[PDB]
Design a protein around this motif. Sequence first.
Motif, short mmCIF file in Angstrom:
data_model
loop_
_atom_site.label_atom_id
_atom_site.label_comp_id
_atom_site.label_asym_id
_atom_site.label_seq_id
_atom_site.Cartn_x
_atom_site.Cartn_y
_atom_site.Cartn_z
N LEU A 1 46.69 32.50 43.46
CA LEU A 1 45.72 32.67 42.08
C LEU A 1 44.96 34.02 42.09
O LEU A 1 44.72 34.61 41.34
CB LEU A 1 45.29 31.30 41.96
N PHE A 2 44.01 34.03 43.56
CA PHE A 2 43.35 34.98 43.70
C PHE A 2 43.60 36.49 43.70
O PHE A 2 43.26 37.58 43.27
CB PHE A 2 42.30 34.77 45.08
N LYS A 3 45.22 36.58 44.24
CA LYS A 3 45.64 37.88 44.09
C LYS A 3 45.93 38.34 42.87
O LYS A 3 46.09 39.44 42.46
CB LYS A 3 47.05 37.71 45.21
N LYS A 4 46.71 37.34 42.03
CA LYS A 4 47.14 37.61 40.61
C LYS A 4 45.81 37.87 39.91
O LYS A 4 45.75 38.95 39.15
CB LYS A 4 47.58 36.35 39.86
N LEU A 5 44.71 37.40 40.12
CA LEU A 5 43.33 37.64 39.42
C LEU A 5 42.94 39.10 39.82
O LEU A 5 42.55 40.02 39.01
CB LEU A 5 42.21 36.51 39.80
N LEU A 6 43.04 39.60 41.08
CA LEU A 6 42.74 40.67 41.62
C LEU A 6 43.58 41.85 41.00
O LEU A 6 43.09 43.09 40.37
CB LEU A 6 42.43 40.61 43.17
N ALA A 7 44.88 41.50 41.01
CA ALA A 7 45.74 42.61 40.34
C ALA A 7 45.33 42.79 38.74
O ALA A 7 45.18 44.03 38.45
CB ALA A 7 47.28 41.98 40.41
N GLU A 8 45.10 41.69 37.92
CA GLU A 8 44.50 41.79 36.53
C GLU A 8 43.39 42.65 36.66
O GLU A 8 43.05 43.25 35.57
CB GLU A 8 44.75 40.70 36.04
N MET A 9 42.42 42.02 37.17
CA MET A 9 40.81 42.56 37.13
C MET A 9 40.95 43.95 37.83
O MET A 9 40.01 44.69 37.44
CB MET A 9 40.17 41.71 38.10
N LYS A 10 41.77 44.49 38.49
CA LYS A 10 41.92 45.99 38.97
C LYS A 10 42.59 46.70 37.72
O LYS A 10 42.10 47.82 37.52
CB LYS A 10 42.83 46.14 40.20
N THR A 11 43.67 46.27 37.24
CA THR A 11 44.31 46.73 35.95
C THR A 11 43.22 47.04 34.87
O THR A 11 43.19 48.17 34.36
CB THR A 11 45.26 46.10 35.47
N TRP A 12 42.37 45.86 34.75
CA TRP A 12 41.26 46.29 33.89
C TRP A 12 40.25 47.23 34.23
O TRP A 12 39.55 47.79 33.18
CB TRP A 12 40.41 44.68 33.78
N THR A 13 40.04 47.51 35.48
CA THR A 13 39.01 48.39 35.91
C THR A 13 39.57 49.68 35.84
O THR A 13 38.69 50.64 36.28
CB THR A 13 38.23 47.88 37.31
N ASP A 14 40.75 49.84 36.03
CA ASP A 14 41.36 51.31 35.94
C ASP A 14 41.09 51.77 34.53
O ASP A 14 40.56 53.27 34.49
CB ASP A 14 43.08 51.21 35.66
N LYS A 15 40.92 51.10 33.61
CA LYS A 15 40.46 51.49 32.30
C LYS A 15 38.97 51.58 32.31
O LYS A 15 38.37 52.07 31.15
CB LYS A 15 40.83 50.46 31.09
N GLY A 16 38.19 51.39 33.29
CA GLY A 16 37.07 51.79 33.51
C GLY A 16 36.05 50.66 32.68
O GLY A 16 34.84 50.85 32.73
N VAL A 17 36.46 49.50 32.50
CA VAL A 17 35.71 48.34 32.13
C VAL A 17 35.17 47.43 33.28
O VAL A 17 35.61 47.39 34.37
CB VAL A 17 36.56 47.27 31.13
N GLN A 18 34.15 46.77 33.22
CA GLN A 18 33.26 45.95 34.06
C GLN A 18 33.76 44.58 33.79
O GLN A 18 34.29 44.12 32.81
CB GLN A 18 31.75 46.11 34.02
N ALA A 19 33.78 44.04 34.83
CA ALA A 19 34.34 42.59 34.86
C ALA A 19 33.22 41.50 35.58
O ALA A 19 32.63 41.91 36.67
CB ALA A 19 35.68 42.21 35.60
#
Lengths: 117, 284, 136
Positions: free
Chosen positions: B94-112
């Motif tokens: 679960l934490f690895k899936k979260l990190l994958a998606e949260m990294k995809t979101w920060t590619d677009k430059g958004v904060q999380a």
Amino acid sequence: QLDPLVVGQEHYDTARGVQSILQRYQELKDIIAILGMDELSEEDKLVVARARKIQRFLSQPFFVAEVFTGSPGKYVSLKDTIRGFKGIMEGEYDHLPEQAFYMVGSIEEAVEKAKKL
Amino acid sequence: AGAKDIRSKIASVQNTQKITKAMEMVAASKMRKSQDRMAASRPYAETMRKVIGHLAHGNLEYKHPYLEDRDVKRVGYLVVSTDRGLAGGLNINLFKKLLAEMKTWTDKGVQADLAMIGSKGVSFFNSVGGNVVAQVTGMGDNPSLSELIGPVKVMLQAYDEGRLDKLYIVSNKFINTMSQVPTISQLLPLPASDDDDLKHKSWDYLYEPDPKALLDTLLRRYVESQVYQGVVENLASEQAARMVAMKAATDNGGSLIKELQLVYNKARQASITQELTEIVSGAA
Amino acid sequence: TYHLDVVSAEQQMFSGLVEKIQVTGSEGELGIYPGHAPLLTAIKPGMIRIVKQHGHEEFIYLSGGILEVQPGNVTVLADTAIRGQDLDEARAMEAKRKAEEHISSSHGDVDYAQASAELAKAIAQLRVIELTKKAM
């Protein structure tokens, strides 16, 4: 001859780090056998992976074993082997798979083997 | 080696196998109690989502921030994790899936931002360095909603205050008694109802006191149940995963017994012969 | 009579057949008889009176919630704890403080604690691998 006053400090430290983390992996094998690898701390999984990568990188093809397997024999200089083990230990090659290190010469052959899987 | 030294370890591994069997049994009972408590929670969220659909997507559709897709510039997650180990790979997938998606979101430059339920994720994300902003830990087998009020309140306030957008809940979906899958689902903006309440045409509620201040409270209470629901499903998934893991550990112990007993047999044979040969050869 | 549900986020509280009920909605007291028009309201923390058909009277304490009534059906989405602007902000303040520090509590599973410590001590220092010749 494995003393810093004979082989230099860098060689000595590299050899001792290799020993230390292979021994730490030995200490974890018995719990991995029972409970599986998912109970390990997040930094213990890292020593396990680096230990398995070191165990693979210790392998080497030989010019005389060129008739048991087909692989060409490789000659590795001391500079290149310490350069490679010091690199593995400090995690600069954490991204490659284990099979990239099996039966290669210097580390620059492992980075190439990784591309071909 | 040494015959006594090996028999001591055979005894130790047998004791370990017995402990793991007891843990498998305890987990297999707690799983049933937890997955019944999971079913006791459906009616609230169901009969409240019908109301929200009537006030939101029905006639005289009202307007509320939580219902509409303002543009996204930073994201928030509610993370549920176990308080106890030995659950297998449950938490790390679960934490690895979260990190994958949260990294995809920060590619677009958004904060999380992150809010943590459970101690394990709190320990993990501070090591990874995540931006945890609220947490609750020590829920154990007794997850209250009156304790989830806090961090869900923090995330709701950060949403309506204009900071967050498009917040998520990440949790493990309990699907089968041996199959649990990590899922990231959207809570706000409210997901789109499959059903249509055009058939509710023919009636309208006598809203006392007034519909907007009431829809606000309805929506706040609804995200809370869905979170609470996520927490309880994650807990039943934890129980099922611990059951499976201790099963596997008991079989691994049962094979180590075979290997250690073969070694012990060889050791005791060698000891008998090495003693009796010394005796016989000593007698001139 | 009509069907009445009293439901919390955690577990259900009442599912009988009722003849009338009385509640303190946010805007005043309020009595629901059968056939009441569809209505939606908040209810204040306090008691609610149920009369089950055959006239059996009982009192249920609610910490608040939302009452929604339909043709021939009614439900009370009861709160499980007192809710308010100040209480929820105090809970959120503590939830934030616990995260700005690194303070964490102890789960209550004494059974898991016992079993985990027993298994940690039993599995410790037993040098099985390199005793059995298992490579892996």
